[PDB]
Each structure stands twice: as C-alpha cells, then as structure tokens.
Design a protein around this ligand. Structure first.
Ligand SMILES: *[C@@H]1O[C@H](CO)[C@@H](O[C@@H]2O[C@H](CO)[C@@H](O[C@H]3O[C@H](CO)[C@@H](O)[C@H](O)[C@@H]3O)[C@H](O)[C@H]2NC(C)=O)[C@H](O)[C@H]1NC(C)=O
Ligand SMILES: *[C@@H]1O[C@H](CO)[C@@H](O[C@@H]2O[C@H](CO)[C@@H](O[C@H]3O[C@H](CO)[C@@H](O)[C@H](O)[C@@H]3O)[C@H](O)[C@H]2NC(C)=O)[C@H](O)[C@H]1NC(C)=O
Ligand SMILES: *[C@@H]1O[C@H](CO)[C@@H](O[C@@H]2O[C@H](CO)[C@@H](O[C@H]3O[C@H](CO)[C@@H](O)[C@H](O)[C@@H]3O)[C@H](O)[C@H]2NC(C)=O)[C@H](O)[C@H]1NC(C)=O
Ligand SMILES: *[C@@H]1O[C@H](CO)[C@@H](O[C@@H]2O[C@H](CO)[C@@H](O[C@H]3O[C@H](CO)[C@@H](O)[C@H](O)[C@@H]3O)[C@H](O)[C@H]2NC(C)=O)[C@H](O)[C@H]1NC(C)=O
Ligand SMILES: *[C@@H]1O[C@H](CO[C@@H]2O[C@@H](C)[C@@H](O)[C@@H](O)[C@@H]2O)[C@@H](O[C@@H]2O[C@H](CO)[C@@H](O)[C@H](O)[C@H]2NC(C)=O)[C@H](O)[C@H]1NC(C)=O
Ligand SMILES: *[C@@H]1O[C@H](CO)[C@@H](O[C@@H]2O[C@H](CO)[C@@H](O)[C@H](O)[C@H]2NC(C)=O)[C@H](O)[C@H]1NC(C)=O
Ligand SMILES: *[C@@H]1O[C@H](CO)[C@@H](O[C@@H]2O[C@H](CO)[C@@H](O)[C@H](O)[C@H]2NC(C)=O)[C@H](O)[C@H]1NC(C)=O
Ligand SMILES: *[C@@H]1O[C@H](CO)[C@@H](O)[C@H](O)[C@H]1NC(C)=O
Ligand SMILES: *[C@@H]1O[C@H](CO)[C@@H](O)[C@H](O)[C@H]1NC(C)=O
Ligand SMILES: *[C@@H]1O[C@H](CO)[C@@H](O)[C@H](O)[C@H]1NC(C)=O
Ligand SMILES: *[C@@H]1O[C@H](CO)[C@@H](O)[C@H](O)[C@H]1NC(C)=O
Ligand SMILES: *[C@@H]1O[C@H](CO)[C@@H](O)[C@H](O)[C@H]1NC(C)=O
Ligand SMILES: *[C@@H]1O[C@H](CO)[C@@H](O)[C@H](O)[C@H]1NC(C)=O
Ligand SMILES: *[C@@H]1O[C@H](CO)[C@@H](O)[C@H](O)[C@H]1NC(C)=O
Lengths: 322, 428, 331, 147, 49, 49
C-alpha cells in the first residue's frame, strides 16, 4: 500500500470524442491530472502544461513531430488554437509540414530531444483499440511521467480491466502549472481521450509473483473498499469491521482579536537616541497597541536572532499578555 | 568457559545452556560499480565563468560519470560545509541516481537562508528548499571575482510575491506587484513596485554583504538505478560464498545465487517484507542475483554437573550440520573454539546436529532434553551419549469375555504435595 | 536473538546496544521460560500413564465397534481415522523440522522456531495406550494394578453409576450398541463436513503467525531517523552523527521487542490455564466417571475417549439422555 | 552535576530518567504477572484444603494417587505441604465371571458385588476386595427371564 | 482512538505518528479483543438454557 | 504549532508523541491483566452455576 497522489476508482472522468471539426479545451492541473486514450494511429502525441500560457510565466511544451519527441520549457507565447498538420506526397510517406504551436521562446532552461514515442505494439493496423494511459505529477519542481500502451477490443467505452503504468522520465522543469491543454494529427478516423484528476489517496497494490500489478482497491472509495484496505487483504469474512473514525470538518474560520489600532512605539525602542548601560539596563513598557515583528525580522542590517520559546515566523499570529 | 560466562558463576548445574549464537564471517569482498571512466565536469560547475542570479539560478545536469568529492572537501579556500543526509567523508563510497546541481550567488548574511525550514527573503521568494532536503551545500566568498568598483548589478532577486513559493520553484515573470489596494498597470506606479531588486556589488562592502557563490547538490540516493559513482575500482565477482559485496553503494554481506526474478529496466532492487534487499541487478552484467546472508544458528552446550565431570557437548539447532565441516577455522567464527569439530561423533536430528556425543540404541528415561525426541545423558569409561527417550515399560493385558481379576490384599501409601501460596512483599 | 534483530551484523550498533545493560538477556530468559513451559504443559497433559498398554488382537467387545478410534496398522503412523481428519483440518505452519515463503524471512532475522520434545508419533502412542487401557480395564488402571473386565459388564457398572439398575443393559445391549455405533458415525460425518470446530486451534496458530509477521514488519519503520536501513545510514553518515540515528533505531526496536515479549507472556499464561483445564478433564473424565454436572459433556456421563490433534486434544464424551417421557399421578 | 551546569546537564539527566523509568516499569509488569500466577496457585491450594482436608474427595487423582482416605496439612516457608493417605490394592487373582444366574427360569443379578467362580463353585464378592459368600436371595434381585 | 488521543485534529502530528508503524493498530486490536471477551463471558455465564 | 516553526515543532512533538504512546501502552497492558483476572472470575461463576 502506498499513500500518495492517485486517481480514485470509478471516477466521474470528463470525456472527449473527436468526431466534423473540433477543439481541445483547457483544463486545470490542480493536484495532478489523469489522462487516457483509446485511439488509432497515435492521434494524441503531446501536451501543454503551464499556469498562464501567454508568455507571462513559463510553460511546458511536449510535441511528437514524427522525427522525434521534443520536450521544451521556455517563456512560450502559445497560439490560441494550437494544432498539428500533415499524405502520400510523392514519397509514399506521410510528412508533418505544420508545427504551429508557439511564437516566442525567449528564455529556455530545459530541453530534450531523443526519439519519437509512437511505440505501436503487436497486431498492427489498429485491429484492437490501443490504450495509451498517461499520468503526470509536478511535485517540488519535479515533473514525473508514466506511460503505457495496451490493446483492447471494446467498441466505445473505457475497457473494464486492470493495468498499471511504468515511469517514463523525470523532468526538473520547476515551473508553476495550474492548467493544461492537450494536442494534432490532422490530415477518416476518430479519437477519444479522458481527463481525470489525481488525488492524494491510498491503494492496495496487488503485485503478482512475477512483479506485475494485477489488481488494486481504494481505501476511501466506499465502505467495502475501506474494509479491504483496513484488512490489507482481498477477501473479507462475514462480520462487523470497525474502520477509520469520522470527524465533522469545520465550516469556516473566525478571527477575533482585540480591536485596537494604534501602532506600537517600537521606534522609541530600536530607533531611540541613547540606551542605558548594561549595568543599569533600561526597561520600557509597551502595551495596548499594534505591533508587527515582520519589519524587525526582515531588516538586513541586523546580526543575530535567537528566539527561545517562539519562532520569528509565528510572531504575527500570536498575542502577548504584556 | 562460555557457559561460565553465561551463568556469571564458577559452578554450572546439570542441563543444557544456550549460549552466544554463531555466524559465518564473510570470506572476501567484491566491488561492482559501473565501469564508466569519464570524469564529471565539476570544472564547469564550481570554476566556470559566471553563475546565474538567485532568482533565475542555473541548473546543470551531471550524469553517467565518476566524481570525487575529496578534492572539493579538502580545499582550504572554501568557507562552509554542512551536509544533510550525507557526510563529507562518506561521499566517495556511494553512488548517486542523478545529480541536480544548483549554483547561484547570494549575500554573506543570507548563507543561513539556504538551510530548509528557515525564513528569509531569498527562501521566501525565489529559492526554497524541501523540509527533508538531502545533499551538500558549498559556500565561499567570490567578491574578488564577481565584484567591481563601479557596481556589479547582474545578480538579481525578487522583492515581492503574491505567495510563498514551493520547494525548488523557479519564477521568471517580471509582473508589477500590487502592494497597495488599488490595481495598476504600466511600467511603474505609486505603491507599484518592480518585483526584482538590484544590488551594487562593490569591493568596499564589508563582511556580511560580500557575494558568496553557493552550489547546492540535491541528489536522491539508493532507490533507483544509480548512474554516478565515486572513484572506487571494480572487482571480479564470485558465487556460492559468504562475501562482503557492494553494488552501487549497497554495502552488505551474504551468499549470492543467480535468481529468476525478471527485473524491469527501471527497477534495480528487490526487497522483502521487512524492507530489506532480496535481489539486485549487477551494474556490469545485466543478470539478476539473489542475496541471502550466509547460514547461522544458535549454540547449545550439553554438560553434566561441574563436580561430576568437565566434558561437554555442542548442538547446532536448525542447521543441517553438513556446513559445520565447511565451518573451517580459516575464516573466524563468533565462537572461537572449534576443537569439537573433529568428527567421528556426528549425528543428525530434526532439532539440528549433535557433535561430541555417541549415539546408542538402548533407551532410557529422558535425562536432559535436546529436541525432536532425542535427549542425552552422562554415564558409562564415562562419556556423553545420545538415545531416543523411552515412554515406559510395555505391558499387555489379558482381555477375555469371561474373566475378571479382583485384588486380595491392599497397601496404604502416603504421598506429599507442595504448593506455593505467597511471595515476598516489596515496595519501591 | 536480540543482538541480530536490533543491530544485525554491525559492530558499531553492537557497541551502542552494549550500553543498555541486560535487556537482551532478560528477553532471552523470558522466552526460554515460555519454551520450557510449553513442554511442561504437554508433558502433564499426555503423560498420565507410565506403562504402555496394548490392545488384544481379538475385537469381540460384545457388539461394540471401536474401529474409528483405534490405530490402523496400515498407516505408517499410529493414527486412527478421526485423528487423520483432525490433522488434515489444521494447516500447521512452520513446524520447525529443519528448514534447510514467509517463514524464510522470519528465520534470517534471528527468529527461530524450536521443535517440540514429544513428537506427533509419541503423542499418538500415549493416546493409544490410554485408550487401550480404558477399553480393557475400566477405571482400575488409573488407580492401581490393571484389572481386566468385560465391556458388557463395565457398561452395566456405568449404568449403576448413573443411578440406573444394571439389568437395563443386559436387556437392551444390542440396541445400545447400535446407538453407540451410529453416534460414532455421526461424529465421523460431522468432523468430515464442518470446519468451524477447529477454529479454537487455528486461532492460536494465526495469532502466533500474525505476531511474528508484525514483528518482522516493524523493521521497516524509520522511528524518526532519516532512513530505516543501518547499512545506508553508515554508508552516508560518518561515525559522529550516525549515533543520533542509531540510538533512535535501537530504542524503537527495543520497544517492539518488549511489546512482543509481554504479549507472548500473557498468551502463554492463558494457554497454561487451558492446559491445566485439559489435564483436569483427562484425569476426571477419562480415568474415571464424574458426577459433576455438565463437566464431562451434556447429560449423565458414562465415559470419554481422548484423541490427539495439532497443539490440542479432542474428547468424545458419551452421555445418557432420556428422550420419551410420560405423565403420571404420584403420592 | 558536579561536572556540567544545568543547561547541558538536563540532556543527560533526562536520558538517565527515561532509562531508569523503563527499568522500573519492566520490573512492575513482571511482578504483576508473577503475582497472577501465584494467585492461581493459592486458589488451587485453598480448594485442595477445603476438599481433601475438611472432607473426603471422590475426584480421581485430585487428592493423591489412588482411592483417597484423608489428608494432613503442614506449614512451609511461603507454601503448604499435604500428606495424602490413599488406598492401593496389591495382589490380584484371575477368575471366571458371569453376568447373571438362571435358577428358577429367572435371571438373578447382584445387589452389590460381582459374580465369581474359582472353577467349581460360584460366589459373590465386593469389587475392591476378595470375600466370597454363598449365593443368597439377600444378595440377588430378580428381573426378567433367561433368554 | 490512537490518532485522536495522541494528535487530535493535527495533520502535522498525524504525519509524525505515521512514521511509527502499527502501534495504533496493535492497541486497537487488543482493545477489540477485550471488548469481545466481555460479551463472551456474559454469554457463557448466563446463556446455559 | 502556533508559536514554533516546523523544525523545532519536530523536536517538541516527537517528545509529546513518545510520552503519550507510553501512557497508552501502559493503559492497554493494565487493561489486559485486569481482563484476564475478570475472565478467571467469570469462569468460576459459570462453574458455580
Ligand atoms: C521535430 O521537432 C524538433 C524540435 O524542434 C526538431 O529538432 C530540430 O532539428 C534541427 C535539425 O535537425 C535542429 O537544428 C540544428 O540541428 C543541428 C544541431 O547541431 C545542426 O547540425 C543544424 O545545422 C541546426 O543547427 C534544431 O535545433 C532542432 N530543434 C531543437 C529545439 O533542438 C526536428 O527537426 C523536428 N522534425 C521535423 C521533421 O520537423
Ligand atoms: C501558481 O499560479 C497560481 C495561479 O495564478 C497561483 O494562485 C493564485 O494566487 C493568487 C494569490 O493569492 C490568487 O489571487 C487571489 O488571492 C486571494 C484568494 O486567496 C484573493 O483574496 C485575492 O484578491 C486574489 O484574487 C489567485 O486567485 C490564485 N489563482 C488561482 C487559480 O487560485 C499560485 O499562487 C502560484 N503558485 C506559486 C508558487 O507561485
Ligand atoms: C466396524 O466399523 C467399521 C466402520 O464402519 C467397519 O468397516 C467398514 O466395513 C464395511 C463393510 O465391511 C466397508 O464397506 C465397504 O466394504 C467393502 C470394501 O471393499 C466393499 O465390498 C463394500 O461395498 C464397501 O465399499 C467400510 O468401508 C468399512 N469402513 C472403513 C472405514 O473402512 C467394520 O466392518 C466394523 N466391524 C464390525 C465387526 O462391525
Ligand atoms: C473353590 O472354592 C470352593 C469353596 O471354598 C472349594 O470347595 C471347598 O473345598 C473344600 C476342600 O478344600 C471343602 O472343605 C471340606 O473338605 C473335605 C471334603 O471331604 C472335608 O472333609 C473338610 O472337613 C471340609 O469340610 C469345602 O466344603 C468346599 N466348599 C464348597 C462350597 O464346595 C473348591 O475346592 C474351590 N476350587 C478350587 C479349584 O480351588
Ligand atoms: C491371570 O491370568 C492371566 C492370563 O490368563 C491366563 O492365561 C494362561 C497363562 C493360563 O494360566 C490361564 O488359565 C489364564 O486364563 C495372566 O496374564 C499372564 O501373566 C503372565 C505372567 O505371570 C504373562 O507371562 C502372560 O503373558 C500373561 N498373559 C497374557 C495373555 O499376556 C495373569 O498373570 C494371571 N494372574 C495371576 C495372578 O496369575
Ligand atoms: C528573458 O528574455 C528577455 C529577452 O531576451 C530578457 O529581457 C532582456 O533583458 C536585457 C538585459 O537587461 C535587456 O537589455 C533587454 O532589453 C530585455 N529585453 C526585453 C524584450 O525586455 C530577459 O532578461 C530574459 N530573462 C532572464 C531571466 O534572463
Ligand atoms: C543435509 O544436507 C545434505 C547435503 O547438503 C543432504 O543430502 C542431500 O540429500 C538430497 C536428497 O536425498 C540429495 O538429492 C542430495 O544429493 C544430497 N546431497 C549430498 C551432498 O549428498 C541431506 O539430505 C540434508 N539433510 C536433510 C535431513 O535433509
Ligand atoms: C458526472 O458529472 C456530471 C457533471 O456534474 C454529471 O452530469 C454526471 O451525472 C456525473 N456522473 C456521475 C456518474 O457521477
Ligand atoms: C521526398 O523526400 C525527400 C528526401 O526525404 C525530400 O527532399 C522531398 O521533398 C520529399 N518529397 C516531397 C514531395 O516533399
Ligand atoms: C530608524 O530609522 C530607519 C531609517 O529611516 C527607519 O527605517 C526605522 O524604521 C527606524 N526605526 C524604527 C524602529 O522605526
Ligand atoms: C578553479 O581554480 C582553482 C585555482 O586554479 C583550481 O585549483 C580548481 O581546480 C578550479 N576548479 C575546478 C573545479 O577545477
Ligand atoms: C564493463 O566492461 C565490459 C567489458 O568491456 C562491458 O561488456 C560492459 O558493457 C561494461 N559495463 C557497462 C555498464 O557498460
Ligand atoms: C558436587 O560434588 C562436591 C564434591 O564431590 C560436593 O561437595 C557437592 O555438594 C556436590 N554438589 C552438590 C550440588 O551436591
Ligand atoms: C541401531 O539399530 C539399527 C538397526 O536396528 C542399526 O542400523 C544401527 O547401527 C544401530 N545403532 C548402533 C549405534 O549400533
């Protein structure tokens, strides 16, 4: 069992279908985003990650433009309608002429180009629908990638079954990302993708004898799964099983501090004319006013701060007797 | 003598006394690090031309090379070395999954702000470290290299932000901060400050304001197929022996055997229930090898009363004692004595192997137990023998459908019985 | 093994463990006491007779058929059909007969399982001796010299014991024998059909297994340290600050060991009480006839038969139950 | 204390206090378990006194080995000693037996005792001691027939 | 409840309590065993008819 | 938590957690011994019945 970012089972995922003409909407990346595809000929080939997307802040760019996959993070000024365009042009081959994705890449801190990622598997010619499943995590500036590819033979919906994703590559992009957009292969074909949202949860990962994940259950999806995760087993005997205790979470916050407004005379303390000697050390009383320790802790002309019984950070959220 | 140690007395009672358990010490050592030889480009990291400013600190990737932190730690021109999760001495014996090198220049008084969990403007706005940071931080002044009398303004940092940044977060935007209540636009305005702050680095500045070049290494260790190692040289591998092995820094001891675990390419280690390693992929040969510590077991000493005799026996519970001949005293053992391993008196039981006793066939009442129905006794020209305990004297009864036996005479017997009732009071 | 469990193969950690005194010795002493107590329990429960009696080759007991409880010579062990069923129903884990699989992980961390002194064949020999002595001589073999007695007269004596005149047996012997055989067959079928009966033993087996599993799993916790593995802690941190982590690890593992030992002591006390009850039941019910109500079974007691089982014993109480009453007028 | 002042002393004092408190707790728990075992033994001793000393017991192998007659207690340091006096038969002779006697076409059964013959004549004897008697109606009760 | 008692309504303290393993689970199991044993005692004493 | 930053909050909360865990363990052990005694009394009561 692992406790980290994971999509709940039986989730109400948003769905897409590329039936014509269409556009790809922009969706948030809050707490991670789950992504899946049952498609033909690898219509989905990239994603756009960022928080502003309009060159105000940095953003992530991934494109699989036939020759190789490009990963690039810059001050991208993406176009409002990003698309890819490509057939049988006097070479029996299909070429991608258009790469209309961005207009400005002023400063770039992370680049990577190795190989294309259209790793099609057995069967060929798309006899069975190909499930390319992807999960992306952006934790403490690390962009982690997981990928899969497996054939299914279901007509329209998500295949009812079990699978797990291998990690692909870790990217130290270190940028703020709150939203994302997906990419395309415009040329006779239909494609669909799911947009799920990762969550910090726990699942019971049932590794087989060979090291492949065969089944998984949730710890908070429903009471039966909560009993399963509590018992750390896939079989439950007849009985009553006490589980995690509930607690009502508070509805709102209330701040009630004394409604005095006059500023404390810390000027008369620090920026006073003269001090008394150490043998006759001076004492000044300050009360019934408003202070702010941030302006004392943020000055660079000071040398030493040793606070005992209190940290310099938590001073502004605390009240003093005298 | 070992039983005398266990009992802390000069007299031992008749019975069996479990003593310090044995273990086979490793026979030799094997080093298996990846055979890369290209030197890591620490020149372009520590002694390059110019470092990117703290608000846009440069990140340089170092991988698939051999590093030696001794030449970085031993230099006297450096100022500070405090490492988290690692020690400066132990860096050369261990490998790294990936090396994330962050280099920048900060103020002399802001060197403290590099430590995670601290508070300051730099950590608050442009460079914050995770609460559980692992790695080393290098600090040293570079005023004579990056300070000019006319003012060096190429190093910048952000003055205001909407909110505290996440660990390892980088911000490049130059959006004007709205310090006041009313919003504003344009290049400048009242209570509308440019986010970045400039400093006039000059050599006339005293200690505490000088530019201090800082390099921070944020590598993660030993949960992945590491690719950066120290200067330790490889060694040939051997199997079926208790050996002090170390693959990519995994110091350990045991006997290794080629297992059948199909390690997937992103997987380098195999672990048991107790989070201890169970298999490993050799960095030079891509096979998978099982790891088990070489055999061990308890030591029991079978002895009669000390006043009666001094000859003793030895038992190895749970050990098929075919390994006892392999326990030659060329490699040492936790029990120093081995003179009993002479042989010609070796017997195997389900409880282990008994050495120093002569097995016989005639049965007796069980004197002192060994286990699994075998127990020993001291008697006759006297030696310690071993036999199967007798349950009793066999006695068949003459059953028939028309006969009875009724007693004619009786005997009166008296029997004693002792029962504890109470124990000594004690108050502490 | 305290030292390997806490500081497996590390001289630096062994030196630190040395500073804590005799904790390891106390734990070893308690565990050895429990181990000896188990053999004491088995000894008292099963060794109530000193001479092994042998059943006669003839099987003419006046119509009574004891084939389902007497040992079968064809099997290499002296186990009857019912005892075979009992040993089949129990899934005994890690008997300890030289393990030259979860039980492998336990063994390599210093967790040893010792074999019992009395084997499952010697226990069956004791049970067979007791059963043959009872069926041949009544209760006299437990009181003194064994005196043979016909079974059709021993049962009349039992009926006289339960307050019924003896001629009832001599007039209903065939029907009584048929009832006894049918009841034995019903026990056969019930033990071959239901499985919840031996939960009382499977429970203690599961408790021991789960306790050992938890003790094994406890090694994976950091207990506040930077890592759970002392080898990596040494390989990363030098001889100075490694102390600050190793002491935390040692304290945590010591608490785990102490909790395990205390729980084992309490469980051993409960098992000792149960074994004392079992020995009392043997002496009162098998070697004689008891007047205590609901002690040797439901109803008026006649006799009992012992049967061995993994880590336990099974009694077969034969009782007398009235069935068909008629109302009358009295004075 | 005589070597380190208060601030750095408290660091060692707390470690010592925790160690000694742990030792005390272990001692108390072990004493509690031993006390429970002793209570069990004392309850068994009290029951043995009440049933064997103050009366005669029919429970097999409770008050000694054999047929119980009486007992005598004796004191001892932190304990008590019982002297169980029991009856044990010594010498047995094998005989020929029969469950009933058919004389006037009716079955005869012993009121108390067993039917016994030495090879030529029949007698009745009590079970635990040999004492033959001439067959008498005072010894037998009649019920049923001989078939 | 082990986590409520030790670290009532504190995520930071819950995270630290998580590092200690199965102490809380063991305590809960022991208490549940005692609770079931009480009902078993009452049943065996009073339910003989 | 409202007075001290996380670094020293660690040094305080770990001590508090150790103390409270010790108290919980002592309570559970004492309850186990008391339950054993009560179980013995209940068995005696059942036999008397
Ligand atoms: C698919 O997208 C790729 C990402 O932009 C793109 O890679 C680009 O490839 C060209 C030529 O292969 C590079 O241009 C330089 O390449 C080498 C580098 O030493 C030089 O010999 C050339 O003269 C030239 O300077 C680009 O740098 C490279 N882009 C990036 C960002 O590195 C592929 O070309 C694209 N494929 C197709 C078919 O369009
Ligand atoms: C990463 O980008 C995020 C998107 O801009 C940003 O979240 C934004 O934070 C600001 C600052 O608080 C919010 O602005 C609002 O803040 C409070 C609400 O708490 C209001 O009272 C203010 O008036 C103001 O409207 C944005 O609302 C918020 N954006 C979203 C979508 O929630 C993150 O802070 C950025 N993270 C880092 C590390 O820079
Ligand atoms: C005492 O009880 C025993 C168990 O009920 C009984 O053994 C059983 O005997 C019957 C018949 O002899 C067997 O039934 C099988 O017998 C032969 C075997 O080849 C077949 O021809 C039959 O059709 C039938 O399959 C039972 O199998 C057997 N039970 C067991 C467990 O082996 C004894 O016969 C009884 N003895 C007396 C004297 O009553
Ligand atoms: C079985 O016990 C029988 C009862 O004791 C016994 O019969 C008895 O035998 C004795 C002889 O030892 C008779 O005693 C008489 O013996 C002669 C016979 O002529 C007389 O002269 C004597 O004065 C004396 O009266 C008993 O009268 C006789 N009793 C009965 C009831 O028959 C058998 O001999 C015993 N059998 C064996 C094999 O031991
Ligand atoms: C009483 O008799 C039994 C056996 O019955 C006898 O068998 C013949 C020996 C013969 O005497 C018959 O008339 C009897 O019915 C005796 O048991 C035997 O004891 C001897 C030792 O004395 C022993 O060698 C035999 O093996 C035993 N028999 C069997 C079948 O094992 C018994 O000892 C006799 N009691 C007395 C006091 O003599
Ligand atoms: C991102 O790129 C822009 C443009 O290349 C940089 O802005 C320039 O900075 C220099 C240095 O002062 C100025 O002389 C130019 O006038 C700027 N150009 C514009 C269009 O404003 C910017 O510095 C880069 N960001 C970082 C962090 O280096
Ligand atoms: C103790 O070990 C020896 C060898 O280490 C075992 O002997 C082996 O027995 C198996 C089974 O009969 C054979 O296939 C092997 O060839 C034997 N090995 C040798 C070297 O002869 C012995 O069986 C072990 N003891 C027990 C009780 O299993
Ligand atoms: C999923 O959410 C949509 C939008 O709120 C709603 O219409 C739909 O019923 C939901 N489906 C499920 C299964 O919750
Ligand atoms: C066919 O391929 C060649 C070389 O790859 C290229 O120069 C040419 O332009 C291609 N044909 C067309 C129509 O683009
Ligand atoms: C002392 O003077 C400086 C310079 O103007 C000022 O910034 C500071 O606030 C004064 N001290 C106090 C305590 O206000
Ligand atoms: C930087 O310069 C010094 C002085 O010449 C030299 O000793 C050092 O090796 C250089 N840095 C590196 C990383 O080589
Ligand atoms: C180590 O050297 C051998 C022999 O030259 C070579 O086959 C092997 O690939 C090398 N190791 C690696 C990791 O390349
Ligand atoms: C051991 O032998 C010596 C001398 O033979 C004797 O004095 C001593 O009492 C014996 N030990 C015991 C426990 O009797
Ligand atoms: C014991 O007897 C067996 C066979 O009965 C024999 O093989 C063995 O050698 C005997 N033991 C001794 C010590 O003679």
């Amino acid at each position: 069992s692992t406790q980290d970012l994971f999509l709940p089972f039986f989730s109400n995922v948003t769905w897409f279908h590329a039936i014509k003409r269409f556009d790809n909407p922009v969706l948030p990346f809050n707490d991670g985003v789950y992504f899946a595809s049952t498609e033909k000929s690898n219509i989905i080939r990239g994603w756009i990650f960022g928080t502003t997307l309009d060159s105000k802040t940095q953003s992530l760019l991934i494109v699989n433009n036939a020759t190789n996959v490009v990963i690039k993070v810059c001050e991208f000024q993406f176009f409002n309608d990003p698309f890819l365009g490509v057939y049988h042009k006097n070479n029996k081959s299909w070429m991608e002429s258009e790469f209309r994705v961005y207009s400005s890449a002023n400063n770039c801190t992370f680049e990577y180009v190795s190989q294309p990622f259209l790793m099609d598997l057995e069967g060929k010619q798309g006899n069975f629908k190909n499930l390319s499943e992807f999960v992306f995590k952006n934790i403490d500036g690390y962009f982690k990638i997981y990928s899969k590819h497996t054939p299914i033979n279901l007509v329209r919906g998500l295949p009812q079954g079990f699978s797990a994703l291998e990690p692909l590559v870790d990217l130290p992009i270190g940028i703020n990302i709150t939203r994302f957009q997906t990419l395309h292969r415009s040329y006779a074909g239909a494609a669909a993708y799911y947009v799920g949202y990762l969550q910090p949860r726990t699942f019971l990962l049932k590794y087989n004898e060979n090291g492949t994940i065969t089944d998984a259950v949730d710890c908070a999806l429903d009471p039966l799964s909560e009993t399963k995760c509590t018992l750390k087993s896939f079989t439950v005997e007849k009985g009553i099983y006490q589980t995690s205790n509930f607690r009502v979470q508070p509805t709102e916050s209330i701040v009630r501090f004394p409604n005095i407004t006059n500023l404390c005379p810390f000027g008369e303390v620090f920026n006073a004319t003269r001090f008394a000697s150490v043998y006759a050390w001076n004492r000044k009383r300050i009360s019934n006013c408003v202070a702010d320790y941030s302006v004392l802790y943020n000055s660079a002309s000071f040398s030493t701060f040793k606070c005992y019984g209190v940290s310099p950070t938590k001073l502004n959220d605390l009240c003093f007797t005298n | 003598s070992e039983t005398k140690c266990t009992l802390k007395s000069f007299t031992v009672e008749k019975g069996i006394y479990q003593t310090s358990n044995f273990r086979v010490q490793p026979t030799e050592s094997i080093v298996r690090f990846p055979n890369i030889t290209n030197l890591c480009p620490f020149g372009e990291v520590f002694n390059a031309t110019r470092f990117a400013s703290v608000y846009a600190w440069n990140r340089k990737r170092i991988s698939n090379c051999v590093a030696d932190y001794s030449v970085l730690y031993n230099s006297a021109s450096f100022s500070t070395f405090k490492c988290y999760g690692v020690s400066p001495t132990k860096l050369n014996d261990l490998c790294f999954t990936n090396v994330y090198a962050d280099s920048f220049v900060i103020r002399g008084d802001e060197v403290r702000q590099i430590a995670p969990g601290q508070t300051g403007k730099i950590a608050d706005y442009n460079y914050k470290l995770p609460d559980d940071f692992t790695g080393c931080v290098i600090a040293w002044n570079s005023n004579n290299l990056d300070s000019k009398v006319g003012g060096n303004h190429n190093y910048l940092y952000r003055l205001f932000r909407k909110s505290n940044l996440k660990p390892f977060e980088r911000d490049i935007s130059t959006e004007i901060y709205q310090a006041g209540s009313t919003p504003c636009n344009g290049v400048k305005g009242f209570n509308c400050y440019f986010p970045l702050q400039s400093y006039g680095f000059q050599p006339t500045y005293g200690v505490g304001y000088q530019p201090y070049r800082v390099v921070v290494l944020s590598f993660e260790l030993l949960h992945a197929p590491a690719t950066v190692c120290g200067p330790k040289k490889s060694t040939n591998l051997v199997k079926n022996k208790c050996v002090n092995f170390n693959f990519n820094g995994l110091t350990g001891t045991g006997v290794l055997t080629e297992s059948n675990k199909k390690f997937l390419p992103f997987q380098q280690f195999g672990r048991d229930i107790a989070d201890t390693t169970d298999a490993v992929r050799d960095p030079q040969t891509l096979e998978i090898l099982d790891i088990t510590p070489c055999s061990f077991g308890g030591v029991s000493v079978i002895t009669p009363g000390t006043n009666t005799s001094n000859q003793v026996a030895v038992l190895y519970q749970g050990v098929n004692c075919t390994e006892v001949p392999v326990a030659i005293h060329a490699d040492q053992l936790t029990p120093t004595w081995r003179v009993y391993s002479t042989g010609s008196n070796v017997f195997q039981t389900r409880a282990g192997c008994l050495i120093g006793a002569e097995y016989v066939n005639n049965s007796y009442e069980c004197d002192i137990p060994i286990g699994a129905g075998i127990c020993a006794s001291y008697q006759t020209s006297q030696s310690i023998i071993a036999y199967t305990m007798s349950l009793g004297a066999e006695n068949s009864v003459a059953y028939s459908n028309n006969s009875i036996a009724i007693p004619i005479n009786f005997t009166i017997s008296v029997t004693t019985e002792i029962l504890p009732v109470s124990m000594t009071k004690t108050s502490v | 093994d305290c030292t390997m469990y806490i500081c497996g193969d590390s001289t630096e950690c062994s030196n630190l463990l040395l500073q804590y005194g005799s904790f390891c010795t106390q734990l070893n002493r308690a565990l050895t006491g429990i181990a000896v107590e188990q053999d004491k329990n088995t000894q008292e429960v099963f060794a109530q007779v000193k001479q092994i009696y042998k059943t006669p080759p003839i099987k003419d007991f006046g119509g009574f058929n004891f084939s389902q409880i007497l040992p079968d010579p064809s099997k290499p062990s002296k186990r009857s059909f019912i005892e075979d069923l009992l040993f089949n129903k129990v899934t005994l884990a890690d008997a300890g007969f030289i393990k030259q699989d979860l039980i492998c992980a336990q063994k390599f961390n210093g967790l040893n399982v010792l074999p019992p002194l009395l084997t499952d064949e010697m226990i069956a020999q004791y049970t067979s001796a007791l059963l043959a002595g009872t069926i041949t001589s009544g209760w006299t073999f437990g009181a003194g010299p064994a005196l043979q007695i016909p079974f059709p007269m021993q049962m009349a004596y039992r009926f006289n014991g339960i307050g019924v005149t003896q001629n009832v047996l001599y007039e209903n012997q065939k029907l009584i024998a048929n009832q006894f055989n049918s009841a034995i067959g019903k026990i056969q079928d019930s033990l071959s059909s239901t499985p919840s009966a031996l939960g009382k033993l499977q429970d203690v087996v599961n408790q021991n297994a789960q306790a050992l599993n938890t003790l094994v799993k406890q090694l994976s916790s950091n207990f506040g340290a930077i890592s759970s593995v002392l080898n990596d802690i040494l390989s990363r941190l030098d001889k100075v600050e490694a102390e600050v982590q190793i002491d935390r690890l040692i304290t945590g593992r010591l608490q785990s060991l102490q909790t395990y030992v205390t729980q084992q002591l309490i469980r051993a006390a409960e098992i000792r009480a149960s074994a004392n009850l079992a020995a009392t039941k043997m002496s009162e019910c098998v070697l004689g006839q008891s007047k205590r109500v609901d002690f040797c079974g439901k109803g008026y007691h006649l006799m009992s038969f012992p049967q061995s089982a993994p880590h336990g014993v099974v009694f077969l109480h034969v009782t007398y139950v009235p069935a068909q009453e008629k109302n009358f007028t009295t004075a | 204390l005589s070597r380190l002042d208060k601030v750095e002393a408290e660091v060692q004092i707390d470690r010592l206090i925790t160690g000694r408190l742990q030792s005390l707790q272990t001692y108390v728990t072990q004493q509690l378990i031993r006390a429970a075992e002793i209570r069990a033994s004392a309850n068994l001793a009290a029951t043995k006194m009440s049933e064997c000393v103050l009366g005669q017991s029919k429970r097999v192998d409770f008050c000694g080995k054999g047929y119980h007659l009486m007992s005598f207690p004796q004191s001892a340091p932190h304990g008590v000693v019982f002297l169980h006096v029991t009856y044990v038969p010594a010498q047995e002779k094998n005989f020929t037996t029969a469950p009933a006697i058919c004389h006037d076409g009716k079955a005869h059964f012993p009121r108390e005792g067993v039917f016994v013959s030495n090879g030529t004549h029949w007698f009745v004897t009590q079970r635990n001691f040999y004492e033959p008697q001439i067959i008498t109606t005072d010894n037998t009760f009649v019920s049923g027939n001989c078939d």
